[PDB]
Design an enzyme around this catalytic site. Structure first.
Site, PDB file in Angstrom:
ATOM      1  N   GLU A 215     -20.337  66.231 -23.116  1.00 43.02           N
ATOM      2  CA  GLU A 215     -20.192  65.630 -24.447  1.00 43.02           C
ATOM      3  C   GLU A 215     -19.129  64.534 -24.468  1.00 43.02           C
ATOM      4  OE1 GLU A 215     -19.701  68.683 -27.665  1.00 43.02           O
ATOM      5  OE2 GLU A 215     -18.155  67.300 -28.326  1.00 43.02           O
TER       6      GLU A 215
ATOM      7  N   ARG B  86      -2.976  60.925   7.572  1.00 42.53           N
ATOM      8  CA  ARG B  86      -2.502  62.314   7.470  1.00 42.53           C
ATOM      9  C   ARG B  86      -2.068  62.934   8.810  1.00 42.53           C
ATOM     10  NH1 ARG B  86      -5.569  65.859   6.479  1.00 42.53           N
ATOM     11  NH2 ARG B  86      -4.892  67.200   4.738  1.00 42.53           N
TER      12      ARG B  86
ATOM     13  N   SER C 170     -22.946  76.538 -29.487  1.00 40.19           N
ATOM     14  CA  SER C 170     -22.800  75.084 -29.704  1.00 40.19           C
ATOM     15  C   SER C 170     -23.692  74.682 -30.840  1.00 40.19           C
ATOM     16  CB  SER C 170     -23.164  74.314 -28.420  1.00 40.19           C
ATOM     17  OG  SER C 170     -23.028  72.898 -28.548  1.00 40.19           O
TER      18      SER C 170
ATOM     19  N   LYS D 259     -20.542  76.638 -21.240  1.00 42.27           N
ATOM     20  CA  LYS D 259     -20.127  76.042 -22.519  1.00 42.27           C
ATOM     21  C   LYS D 259     -19.070  74.948 -22.316  1.00 42.27           C
ATOM     22  CE  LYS D 259     -19.594  74.944 -26.464  1.00 42.27           C
ATOM     23  NZ  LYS D 259     -18.807  75.483 -27.547  1.00 42.27           N
TER      24      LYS D 259
ATOM     25  N   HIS E 127     -20.829  71.994 -20.903  1.00 44.08           N
ATOM     26  CA  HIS E 127     -21.393  71.349 -22.088  1.00 44.08           C
ATOM     27  C   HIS E 127     -20.377  70.406 -22.761  1.00 44.08           C
ATOM     28  CE1 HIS E 127     -21.987  70.810 -26.412  1.00 44.08           C
ATOM     29  NE2 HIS E 127     -23.247  70.612 -26.063  1.00 44.08           N
ATOM     30  N   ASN E 128     -19.200  70.949 -23.063  1.00 45.19           N
ATOM     31  CA  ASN E 128     -18.107  70.225 -23.721  1.00 45.19           C
ATOM     32  C   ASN E 128     -17.672  68.998 -22.917  1.00 45.19           C
ATOM     33  OD1 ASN E 128     -14.735  70.774 -24.852  1.00 45.19           O
ATOM     34  ND2 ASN E 128     -16.523  70.320 -26.159  1.00 45.19           N
TER      35      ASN E 128
HETATM   36  O1  LIG Z   1       6.082  65.082   2.713  1.00 46.97           O
HETATM   37  C1  LIG Z   1       5.604  65.533   1.646  1.00 46.97           C
HETATM   38  O2  LIG Z   1       5.872  65.041   0.526  1.00 46.97           O
HETATM   39  C2  LIG Z   1       4.643  66.694   1.720  1.00 46.97           C
HETATM   40  O3  LIG Z   1       5.315  67.919   2.021  1.00 46.97           O
HETATM   41  C3  LIG Z   1       3.615  66.403   2.803  1.00 46.97           C
HETATM   42  O4  LIG Z   1       3.011  67.631   3.232  1.00 46.97           O
HETATM   43  C4  LIG Z   1       2.593  65.361   2.313  1.00 46.97           C
HETATM   44  O5  LIG Z   1       3.226  64.472   1.377  1.00 46.97           O
HETATM   45  C5  LIG Z   1       1.342  65.957   1.665  1.00 46.97           C
HETATM   46  O6  LIG Z   1       1.631  67.157   0.943  1.00 46.97           O
HETATM   47  C6  LIG Z   1       0.285  66.282   2.701  1.00 46.97           C
HETATM   48  O7  LIG Z   1      -0.809  66.901   2.046  1.00 46.97           O
HETATM   49  P1  LIG Z   1      -2.283  66.555   2.564  1.00 46.97           P
HETATM   50  O8  LIG Z   1      -2.237  66.868   4.040  1.00 46.97           O
HETATM   51  O9  LIG Z   1      -3.139  67.487   1.748  1.00 46.97           O
HETATM   52  O10 LIG Z   1      -2.459  65.092   2.273  1.00 46.97           O
END
Ligand SMILES: O=C(O)[C@H](O)[C@@H](O)[C@H](O)[C@H](O)COP(=O)(O)O
Lengths: 470, 471
Positions: B191, B448, B130, B184, B187-188
């Site tokens: 920056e 979820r 660098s 590196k 670093h970039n």
């Molecule tokens: O229905 C869908 O479009 C996916 O297949 C489904 O699995 C969800 O949308 C996320 O992929 C979950 O991922 P996370 O549990 O990591 O949020």
């Protein structure tokens, strides 16, 4: 002389089970296979009464399907999908169709497609959305590959896909990996939407002091308006649930460590590859990583000072409306970015994406489904070449009206020490995007100063370099 | 008789490799050079008259011209050209010889090449360099990773040519395999963040206080005399003194606001996503360059999208200037905290045992981010080597407690005035998320489990749970 089944499904985690079950319920006969026997045994237990049969080798599996064979792959992405394709190749015949419904990286779909294509086998990489309940009842199906191959599988996709007002949530997306690409972007947008909802929740919780009951009433009320959506609906429902032993709401019993699949970063990673700004979705992914660092956060909270904050005493109703507006505008900014990414990708890979059609299939089945998507379709109806959703007259009128509220939410969060990473990055995007002369004139000057990287000028065409050191 | 065996060889004679060559020779090492395209070698030799540099004209001749164990510096185009070169060297090298790749290489390619070459008993050092072209000539920062036994052999050369600060060369053994090229990259990344943050300070002063070139220059010059003292602030102050000859405007006002970047700029951010580390400030800075590159869209939108209809500024001017300064420093702290926590995550993932104080130390001179700032990072790790985050250090903790009110005022003013501050805003958000013991991720986790049965943990019980949300 065995009697030939209409569609084959390999891979029997719940997503593939529920899709095979969906397919059967639409009057198709199914053969299934799983590397691990015990999963096929368990599926055949669950599946009795249905027109589904088990096979225990890949020979048997291929041999039980009617030509042109229609094989749906729902195995773990990566090597296991590739290893299943290698197993299939010796026994497939010219014209057969392998459909990868897994959550697959689009560039793997590109390679497989070419590799199978040279053997005479059609490959369709398709995204399937809706979670387990969707797969079973009506997913969004996002298929890409050979058009002629798609036409052969289209009637099944349309049969099992969700319907919104009589209209199937599936369409031909584009060639090779375009379907899995759109599925990726869909998953990006989803992370975005959940983060912005979380921010809205956290603001109400800490600015207004809202408890589970009132939070539910706010989100329930929001879901009857323009924010009407599956995520806001389930959000409002989640706040009604009470844990079974403490008496507190379940959501307050849940550990604030956001998991995510390894596929959650792809949208952001490909945005970096293409040169498209994806701040809101990316902040959302980083927000999940930060939440996963729980131990660091609880320790940090005990030594890092926040600001001094006397209790909030603005108008309560006005503030709730400011949050609601902040959320809608921020959501608009996020999709504006996501749809810009899909455009850029369409240009890069020559996919000729139809953005109204894409918005149409996100309308039902998928996790991000929402009334809002109708206005996105309307936008691309009016101008298929539209470069950014913010320029469409509906979204433009909304952002000009709701910008004061986002400004207020960002300013208020800053002074009160509430983290709103997605909302704030949405506001910085809106102000950057609409500004004709940004401070990158300085950045370019710097880069020519230390690196001789050259610059351009506002007043004349050309490539210019300055000997900066006098 | 006897071709006069040289101590080190350099392949690749663009300005960088030529300047490294000349740097090495000026330290009393003899150098053999080679370049696939012949005219570059010829030109360089007439540039290097009277210096202990010899030209060679085939990989064979080049390799036979060097002392064993051979030390070969690659300064060629990244990718295929670098592997093409290594592949031609292989037949001619021996157990113990040392190939050093000095390009801005992706650390995974180094890892692959390292093991590919270890198989044949040849050592590989992937090293960042660098400082630019002038810095390669005069004194760069050098960040070698690879086999230790091989680094000990070339260490004296690296230490001779590197920049020095207070008697310590801006070079250290970073760690194994691709360790050096990784650092590196970070670093970039750092920056990019710093430039964005200073760009934001400029825009804030420009728009809120209506400052012209001349007064911006006085402000950035004042800032360089305090804690912000750094090469980037320094050159920023100088940039605002430049005048365009044709138009008579400040040169900076005539330069197109369309920030370029090498394909390398994005790597740090992509890697952070791979490791699961939050890197919001540097990533927003990369996206801000992409945004600026969309100049034509932006001017189109500017005629169509309205911002807030806000009054001109009437607050105290000196106060606002100092607020911007403070917001800029705290923001910078947050970016570095994020970048160093990435390296920590990386060190753990690839088993590198990185020394974060030594890394800050070699960023003190030679490199573009060089600032007295880096000394305070060095000091934090000399205090606590396994410090998980720099925000927790006595020095940085004191700054953020005293400066956070400037940052907040700046973010709130930016929002209300419609001046974009993606970097500083995300800095605040990170600070406020990091120090917050219960984040809204409990709702996210509920969501979820509700739609995809991904399961959750709880605050009260120590297990793994899944609710049937439809009962
Ligand atoms: O229905 C869908 O479009 C996916 O297949 C489904 O699995 C969800 O949308 C996320 O992929 C979950 O991922 P996370 O549990 O990591 O949020």
């Amino acid at each position: 002389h065995m009697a030939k089944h209409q569609i084959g499904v390999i891979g029997l985690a719940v997503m593939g089970k529920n899709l095979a079950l969906n397919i059967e319920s639409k009057g198709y006969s199914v053969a299934v296979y799983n590397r691990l026997r015990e999963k096929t045994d368990e599926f055949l237990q669950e599946a009795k009464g249905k027109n589904i049969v088990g096979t225990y080798s890949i020979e048997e599996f291929v041999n039980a399907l009617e030509k042109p064979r229609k094989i749906l792959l729902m195995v773990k992405a990566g090597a296991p999908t590739d290893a299943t394709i290698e197993q299939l190749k010796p026994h497939l015949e010219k014209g057969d169709i392998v459909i990868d419904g897994g959550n697959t990286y689009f560039k793997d779909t590109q390679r497989r497609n070419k590799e199978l294509a040279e053997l005479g086998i059609h490959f369709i990489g398709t995204g399937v959305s809706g979670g387990e309940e969707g797969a079973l009842k009506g997913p969004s199906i996002m298929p890409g590959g050979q058009k002629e191959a798609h036409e052969l599988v289209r009637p099944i996709f349309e049969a099992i896909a969700a319907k919104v007002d009589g209209e199937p949530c599936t369409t031909y997306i584009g060639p090779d990996g375009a379907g899995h690409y759109v599925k990726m972007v869909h998953n990006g947008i989803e992370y975005g939407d959940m983060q912005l909802i979380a921010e809205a929740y956290f603001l109400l919780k800490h600015v207004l002091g809202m408890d589970a009951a009132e939070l539910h009433e706010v989100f329930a009320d929001w879901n009857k308006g323009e924010l009407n959506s599956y995520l806001i609906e389930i959000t409002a429902d989640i706040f009604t649930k009470i844990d079974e032993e403490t008496g507190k709401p379940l959501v307050d019993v849940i550990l604030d460590k956001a998991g995510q699949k390894g596929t959650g970063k792809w949208t952001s990673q490909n945005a970096l590859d293409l040169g498209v700004p994806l701040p809101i979705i990316t902040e959302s992914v980083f927000a999940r990583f930060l939440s996963a660092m729980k131990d660091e956060r609880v320790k940090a909270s005990k030594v890092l000072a926040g600001p001094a904050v006397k209790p909030f005493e603005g108008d309560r109703a006005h503030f709730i409306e400011a949050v609601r507006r902040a959320l809608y505008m921020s959501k608009i900014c996020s999709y504006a970015q996501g749809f810009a990414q899909m455009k850029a990708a369409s240009e890069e890979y020559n996919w000729n994406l139809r953005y109204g059609d894409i918005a149409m299939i996100f309308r039902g089945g998928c996790i991000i489904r929402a009334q809002f998507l109708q206005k996105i379709k309307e936008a691309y109806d009016r101008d298929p070449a539209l470069s950014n959703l913010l320029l469409d007259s509906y979204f433009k009128d909304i952002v000009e009206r709701y910008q004061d509220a986002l400004r207020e939410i960002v300013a208020t969060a800053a002074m009160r020490g509430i983290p709103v990473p997605g909302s704030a990055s949405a506001l910085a995007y809106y102000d950057s995007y609409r500004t004709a002369v940004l401070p990158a004139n300085l950045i370019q000057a710097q880069r020519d100063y230390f690196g001789a990287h050259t610059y351009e000028r506002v007043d004349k065409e050309g490539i210019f370099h300055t000997e900066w050191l006098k």
